[PDB]
DNA sequence: GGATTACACCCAAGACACCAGGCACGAGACAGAAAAAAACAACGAAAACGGCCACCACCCAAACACACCAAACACAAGA
């Protein structure tokens, strides 16, 4: 279970959109922004 | 099963976690596991009764013969 965690915390502190699981979240309620989220997309580093 | 779905600009409005069961320590009880003893198997020593050879006599087995019966070539009959 712990190591487990720690799998957990180190795959969405990189990549928070993982398919059929739940996301890394912030006690308001948002997802935490991984380093993917912040690379991709219109208003990403590459595009933005 | 994911992943993508125009470009630029302006303004306003709200929040910027609170609260509840788990880790440590905090102490009991049968279960996770350890110690023991008494009825479990065997073997050593004595007792006398069941087992082996005699002795023995009556009942079943073999020989002799009887009459009786089953049977087998063939002289005769027959198609």
Partial sequence: EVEQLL???VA???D???AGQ???LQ???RPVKAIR???K???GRLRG
Wanted: charged residues 25%.
């Fill in 37 to 39: 989220a912040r690379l």
């Fill in 22 to 24: 739940p996301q890394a």
């Fill in 7 to 9: 799998q957990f915390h």
């Fill in 27 to 29: 006690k308001s309620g």
């Fill in 41 to 43: 997309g219109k208003e």
């Fill in 16 to 18: 928070n959109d993982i």
């Fill in 12 to 14: 969405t502190y990189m």
